[PDB]
Design a protein around this ligand. Structure first.
Ligand SMILES: [Mg+2]
Ligand SMILES: [Mg+2]
Ligand SMILES: [Mg+2]
Lengths: 152, 152
DNA sequence: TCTGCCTTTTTTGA
DNA sequence: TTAGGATCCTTCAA
DNA sequence: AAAAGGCAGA
DNA sequence: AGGATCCTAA
């Protein structure tokens, strides 16, 4: 586990509270045990003119990647262990996204159990609902209620 | 001078590079000496549901105020002396907006002289142009060249 | 089955 | 005349 | 910013 | 985010 230095984390926590996004999703998928899978994504968006800043961020975090979507680019981190390690260290300095980060950490820690039982899966889905409720969510479709309905 | 805590400045520098703005303007107004004046503004924008974060910023910076503009709110600092003191302290920690901050400080140091001469005002006006060039400027109208039609 | 990465869209919150 | 504040707008960069 | 849908390797 | 324009009291 990479240890990040404090001044880096302090600055990055400010930048993330501004331009970053901690995204939790429930995605239908017929080949998963409960017909859904979870996705947890840390993203930082910036105008492509400033892609260099996201490229520097890949070097600094040591994991993740940058993708261009024409006018804007995004630093993305999904791999679960590195995401856990990174958010564990960032979260104490977050002010606006602190609660999202800690929910993602709780989800991650419970993933093994979530995959064992429908009730446990549903409960972790409600934690995803709570993250979306904290974000400025506007286009969300699949919720823990969606999952529950697939009771059956 | 109010001296700001390092951990505060680091976090805020990150938050500023993300959601903040360092704005320099030339405003036409026929009741001023050179038919224009300079306006320098430090701004942090946020959705009004998170206005409390901006209100907190007024207490932490010790000066400035928050304006509600409907769906979003803005922390604003204009008063030239505390602006100079604040930017002086924040600038070392800025990564995207360091040059804008240093141009504002440069302009602020010359504000006394800038009336002295038509030549010198015009020069300071080009420093305003340079801040706008660094920003993601899209609606700018009055530039140093507008001023130069002081050639009458 | 499961995870990470690829692609694209929506609607603001800057 | 001036500085600081008030109001409104545009176009994205999140 | 914050989702949506989808592929394919492990 | 990054402007443009208008108000007003000292
Ligand atoms: Mg933001
Ligand atoms: Mg930004
Ligand atoms: Mg932003």
């Amino acid at each position: 586990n990479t240890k990040y230095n404090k001044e880096f984390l302090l600055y990055l926590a400010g930048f993330v509270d501004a331009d970053g996004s901690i995204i939790a999703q429930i995605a239908p998928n017929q080949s998963s045990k409960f017909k859904h899978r979870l996705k947890l994504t840390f993203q930082v968006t910036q105008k492509t003119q400033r892609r260099w800043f996201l490229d520097k961020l890949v070097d600094e975090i040591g994991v993740g990647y940058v993708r261009g979507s024409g006018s804007v680019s995004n630093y993305i981190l999904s791999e679960i262990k590195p995401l856990h390690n990174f958010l564990t260290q960032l979260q104490p300095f977050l002010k606006l996204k602190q609660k999202q980060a800690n929910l993602v950490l709780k989800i991650i820690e419970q993933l093994p159990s979530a995959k064992e039982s429908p009730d446990k899966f549903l409960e972790v889905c409600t934690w995803v609902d709570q993250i979306a409720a904290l974000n400025d969510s506007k286009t969300r479709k699949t919720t823990s209620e969606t999952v529950r309905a697939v009771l059956d």
